[PDB]
């Protein structure tokens, strides 16, 4: 909801919980295949869904 | 730090139009509050809304930046932890 | 060694059928638990789907009957190369199923509460979410796992650990439905997120990251089936 | 709609909605209807339900088929949450604007933080027309009159589509190059520098610079295009007025109450007094939104939802005009199909077999007094 | 001093300090001054500020430049925390003793547990003399009169110095022996017994015994030198008396309030009644410690801090003697540099654009009535 996108809790929570999967997927899509994306892919999937 | 700090700036151009103030039946409300008021969410009463409400230890306008720096600092640790978590998920061990 | 059952993904037509059945037979004909219209279009649905899912899981999981000597690592890049393609067809099916189960219908159920339906004692967007989609993707994941176990040489060495996580891991949200409906009752919280009652099957989406291990494995016996033919 | 699944004792000992009035039952899109009445907070509140320090006057409907054009409690607009006191009576009113055609059950509910939804009686309202005609005009403190239904939409679409296409282009830059297999072999052999060439790293800078640039220009342009922007408002409204109703001189004491299991009937034994100045008579017993009336004394004239209205559901052993002083004891029997239809008989599964209700008395003139009753309900197994 | 950084709406809708009186503004060391007045707890308390079940009457100063010789609320000493009720008025008094020369801004504040500091208006007080002259004599329940400024100091110094010298001696016993390098080589080779010889281990016993001994002798000697010792006292003081002020018969209803952005002026529209028996007039509007007066009706005589005093800041369209009954509506304009100096105009950044204030009326005789006002403040953008 737009009326929940405030200045204190939204800005605090969204990025924190959002950075989880990008970091995890990056831990093998970088040292196994030097894949530059992987956070972009996570975010593209999240946004599409 | 970047992840934490780029969020609100990256979203502001999208939600700014909905922060124009409005006087509705004598009370002042933003267009976003007016939306939340008009379109009934029978399952989401207003009081569950976890948004900034002001305190005696809060300053007049300092929420957005302070919450983006705190979020960046915590994102540091979150990325740290989930790097190792993901390294584990990449394991090829057999049991 | 593909382009056959990969394009035969009937998941869309079937799921396109429920999204229609939902918006046509559960909008008002399923708003009230009542007794007649509900147990006609939604409870019979539930029973039929449970029995069909149990039987389809018991049947489809017969790759142990088609299993045999799987020394395809001694074979050239023809028989074993062909099996990996089948494995990845299974995995694409599993991906579609996981998408529809954990993303589409889960957030659709999220939409449903915010409108009217308080979870009290039930929801008809629950027959479609916890008892149709989750068992479907569970069946698909188990099928893929068993296929790899019974048909690829590199998997004959005892139950890859990460393959178990992109599997039974996502299975642990089904029994997790006990946490919710109990955290929604005597511990309720009318949200999806702050309510730690939902953190149960938040510890299930993580498990859906075991496709980092299956991919590492399937790109270690396959990297040795393509090395010689570089250019 | 889901009130039927809530604990029977909870539905009976929380909030009592009476004097309800629906201004219409057949509306067209863009038309308005109102719901008015009063509700009385029960002093014998349930223990597991937090006291209503924080409550929100809501509307029960399947999504925004109407829009809440306004809502008042005691004459004040209440867009925020409010505070209530146990034992008080409040007058409320809600103004709806029809938005989506169909037939909808419209309930009046009160969300109580730490408690839950407290659903009042519902009414069937029909909306006719086409949703494409709905208009939600609004004038801002700059005015600037806008249409809240579609305002700012193109901006959302444009910005999200732009950022998405930017992110897709990043992946596309690397997608043309064979991925996975050659990259695995490369780092496995020790050629970790697979496709991270200088030209491939300078593309990263452009993207990173073009990104950090667009954000700043966009912030500036937004500040210049919308010079006035307040934060999301919020905050309790403690100051809410109740109703100064005179104390019901007619005092009723429940000696004992029981209900037949199975069966759709309850039986009270009341000791009534008439400290008032005029002869009174028991007119209606209201509990859990069900209205049991005694046809010989009172009949409904507010189009109360029929499935909740028991015209002759109330049966008093002696409803002879109770005159001044003149204490008396009578056996009341409230029976109706709604006792079983609305799962009120499921009080047997409740870990608290008690009840609460609203007694209404009428004089010779036709005035009404409202008395509160409550006591344990004892299942009499047949 | 830091009140200027607190949320504007919080400063306006919490506690209102009035009838303030400072007994002096120029004190010498060892001299006393008092601060008296009343404060009214606002019933429309902020949601995020816990209700004042636990409050402490404090003093705002940069460290102990004064010492709080005493403090009363309603006549009782309040060294502990206290309880307050929303909507009550209390009389308070504080007694200070000058300790350190300089010029200090002395504020009256109320700490609210779960809330924060609620700072009242400050006054500039000057202390003259030399801090070396400060005396804090006290007589104990044994009496035994002591000087709390330096009492028991030699004991603290002696004991801490003794224990420190004991700990230094332990390290010194081992510091003469070459440390680090030879010790590393020793355990690396397998001579773990580097410098732990029997004589080195018997020194450990002496220290351990000499320590465990001194503690016991010292406990005994303390018990014998101070035979009477109570535990640190503490505990809420719920019983706090308020003020039985007659209900202000003059009733004021705010129709609407707005403020110019930018600008240092606010504008209310009041509907006033005079249910009283004598003709009244609007004298002062007090909000967030700022006092807007109407020179034609009332002028300050309490040396109120000038930077918070607007002698002619209040402007009423019609301040003609409002006689009995005789309802009326007027447009009030409270304007002063302090609106911008004390960051009250920053209500625009507050996620709650509302306000609360204190209206004072005066009769022909000169009596004062105190009415409470509160409503939404609407930024009128110029
Ligand atoms: C990429 C740098 C852009 C900096 C934009 C900015 O300073 O925004 C400040 C805004 C604070 O908004 P506020 O204090 O209300 O003042 C700005 C007024 N508005 C909200 C109307 C734009 O909160 C944030 O966006 C935190 C981001 C910090 C990045 C270093
Ligand atoms: C809560 C974070 C714990 C992550 C620890 C980890 O990376 O696992 C190390 C360990 C095995 O350690 P080791 O034999 O050294 O192998 C390290 C290589 N990986 C990371 C692939 C397992 O694997 C497990 O048993 C899974 C951990 C519990 C699930 C969160
Ligand atoms: C809640 C997180 C679970 C983390 C699992 C883990 O780190 O434990 C590793 C453990 C290590 O012992 P394991 O290798 O099972 O014992 C040797 C197995 N054999 C006898 C075949 C060699 O194996 C299992 O947990 C069993 C599989 C669990 C699937 C969810
Ligand atoms: C829900 C349908 C998903 C489609 C699964 C798929 O395409 O996998 C093809 C695979 C065929 O792979 P294939 O290499 O033919 O099987 C291994 C070779 N055999 C069976 C002769 C040992 O099917 C099976 O193994 C059994 C299918 C039963 C459900 C339709
Ligand atoms: C594995 C779950 C078993 C579901 C059994 C079933 O068909 O539901 C009937 C019954 C519910 O019966 P009841 O609510 O008394 O009456 C059903 C009729 N309606 C739908 C109108 C309420 O369910 C239960 O046993 C409790 C819920 C399952 C545990 C999560
Ligand atoms: C962050 C704490 C857990 C990290 C464990 C990772 C395995 C050890 C590194 C070789
Ligand atoms: C009283 C609630 C306590 C909840 C314990 C933690 C629940 C874990 C959920 C998996
Ligand atoms: Cu649900
Ligand atoms: Cu209904
Ligand atoms: Cu100061």
From TrEMBL, chain B:
Source organism, top-level taxon: Bacteria
Regions that span the bilayer: 63-85
Protein name in UniProt: Particulate methane monooxygenase, A subunit
Organism: Methylotuvimicrobium alcaliphilum (strain DSM 19304 / NCIMB 14124 / VKM B-2133 / 20Z) (Methylomicrobium alcaliphilum)
From TrEMBL, chain C:
Highest taxon of source: Bacteria
UniProt cross-references to Pfam families, sorted A to Z: AmoC
Record EC number: 1.14.13.25
Sequence intervals crossing the membrane: 4-21, 41-64, 85-106, 126-148, 160-179, 199-222
GO molecular function per UniProt: methane monooxygenase [NAD(P)H] activity
Coiled coil: none
Residue numbers binding Cu(2+): 109, 113, 119, 126
Keywords for this protein: Membrane, Metal-binding, Monooxygenase, Oxidoreductase, Transmembrane, Transmembrane helix
Gene3D superfamilies reported for this sequence: Particulate methane monooxygenase subunit c2. Chain: C
Keyword Metal-binding assigned: yes
Protein name listed in UniProt: Particulate methane monooxygenase, C subunit
Gene name in the database record: pmoC
TrEMBL record, chains D, E:
A single MF term (Gene Ontology): methane monooxygenase [NAD(P)H] activity
Top-level EC class: oxidoreductase
Binding site for Cu(2+) 1: 1, 105, 107
Keywords of the record: Metal-binding, Monooxygenase, Oxidoreductase, Signal
Oxidoreductase recorded as keyword: yes
Pfam family, one: Monooxygenase_B
Enzyme Commission number: 1.14.13.25
Residue sites binding Cu(2+) 2 per the record: 16, 40
Record keyword Signal present: yes
Protein name: Particulate methane monooxygenase, B subunit
Gene from which the chain derives: pmoB
């Amino acid at each position: 909801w737009t009326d929940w996108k405030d200045r204190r809790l939204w800005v605090t929570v969204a990025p924190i919980v959002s950075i989880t999967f990008p970091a995890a997927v990056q831990a093998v899509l970088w040292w196994r295949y030097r894949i530059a994306w992987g956070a972009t892919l996570c975010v593209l999937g999240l946004l599409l869904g | 730090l970047a992840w934490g700090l780029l969020f609100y700036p990256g979203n502001w151009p999208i939600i700014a139009p909905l922060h124009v103030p409005v006087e509705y039946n004598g009370m002042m409300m933003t267009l976003a509050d007016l939306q939340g008021y008009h379109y009934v969410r029978t399952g989401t009463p207003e009081y569950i809304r976890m948004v900034e409400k002001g305190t005696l230890r809060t300053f007049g306008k300092d929420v957005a930046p302070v919450s983006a720096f705190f979020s960046g600092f915590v994102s540091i640790l979150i990325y740290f932890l989930w790097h190792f978590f993901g390294s584990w998920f990449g394991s090829e061990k057999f049991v | 060694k593909k382009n056959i059952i990969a394009g035969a993904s009937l998941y869309l037509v079937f799921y396109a059928w429920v999204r229609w059945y939902e918006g046509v037979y559960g909008w008002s004909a399923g708003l009230d638990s009542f007794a007649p219209e509900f147990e006609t279009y939604w409870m019979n649905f539930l029973y039929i789907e449970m029995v069909l899912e149990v039987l389809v899981a018991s049947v489809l999981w017969g790759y142990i009957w088609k299993s045999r000597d799987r020394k395809v690592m001694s074979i050239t890049p023809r028989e074993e190369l062909r099996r990996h393609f089948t494995h990845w067809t299974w995995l694409m099916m599993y991906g579609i199923a996981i998408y529809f189960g954990a993303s589409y219908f889960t957030e659709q159920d999220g939409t449903w509460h915010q409108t009217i339906v308080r979870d009290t004692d039930f929801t008809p967007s629950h027959i479609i979410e916890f008892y149709l989609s989750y068992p479907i993707y569970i069946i698909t994941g188990g099928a893929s796992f068993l296929y790899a176990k019974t048909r690829l040489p590199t998997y004959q060495q005892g139950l890859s650990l990460q393959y178990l996580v992109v599997v039974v891991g996502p299975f642990m949200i089904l029994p997790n439905v006990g946490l919710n409906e109990w955290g929604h009752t005597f511990w309720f919280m009318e949200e999806l997120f702050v309510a730690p009652l939902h953190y149960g099957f938040v510890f299930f989406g993580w498990s859906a990251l075991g496709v980092l291990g299956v991919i590492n494995i399937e790109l270690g016996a396959l990297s040795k089936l393509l090395k010689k033919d570089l250019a | 709609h889901g009130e039927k699944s809530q604990a029977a004792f909870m539905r009976m000992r929380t909030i009592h909605w009476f004097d309800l009035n629906w201004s219409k039952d057949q509306v067209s899109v863009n038309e308005t209807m109102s719901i008015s009445g009063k509700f009385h907070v029960f002093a014998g509140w349930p223990e597991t339900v937090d006291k209503p320090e924080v409550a929100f006057l809501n509307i029960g409907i399947p999504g925004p088929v109407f829009i809440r054009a306004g809502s008042w409690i005691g004459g004040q607009l209440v867009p925020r949450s409010v505070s209530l006191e146990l034992g008080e009576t409040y007058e409320f009113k809600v103004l709806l604007k029809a938005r989506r055609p169909g037939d909808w059950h419209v309930h009046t509910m009160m969300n109580v933080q730490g408690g839950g939804p407290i659903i009042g009686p519902g009414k069937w309202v029909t909306i006719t027309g086409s949703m494409g005609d709905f208009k939600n005009p609004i004038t801002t403190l700059t005015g600037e009159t806008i249409d809240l239904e579609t305002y700012a939409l193109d901006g959302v679409y444009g910005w999200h589509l732009f950022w998405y296409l930017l992110g897709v282009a990043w992946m596309v830059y690397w997608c043309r190059k064979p991925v996975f297999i050659p990259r695995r072999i490369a780092v496995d052999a020790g050629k970790a520098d697979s496709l991270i060439t200088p030209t491939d790293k300078k593309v990263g800078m452009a993207f990173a610079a073009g990104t950090l640039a667009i954000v700043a220009v966009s912030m500036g342009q937004a500040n210049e295009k919308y010079p006035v922007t307040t934060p999301l408002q919020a905050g309790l409204m403690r100051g809410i007025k109740s109703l100064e109703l005179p104390q019901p001189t007619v005092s009723v004491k429940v000696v004992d109450a029981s209900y037949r299991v199975p069966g759709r009937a309850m039986q009270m034994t009341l000791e009534i007094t008439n400290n008032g100045d005029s002869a009174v008579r028991l007119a209606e017993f209201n509990t859990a939104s069900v209205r049991f009336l005694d046809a010989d004394v009172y009949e409904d004239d507010t189009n109360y939802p029929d499935d909740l209205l028991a015209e002759e559901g109330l049966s008093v052993s002696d409803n002879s005009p109770l005159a001044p002083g003149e204490t008396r004891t009578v056996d009341v029997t409230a029976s109706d199909a709604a006792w079983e239809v609305y799962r009120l008989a499921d009080l047997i599964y409740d870990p608290d077999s008690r009840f609460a209700g609203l007694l209404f008395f009428i004089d010779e003139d036709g005035n009404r007094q409202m008395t509160m009753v409550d006591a344990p309900l004892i299942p009499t197994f047949i």
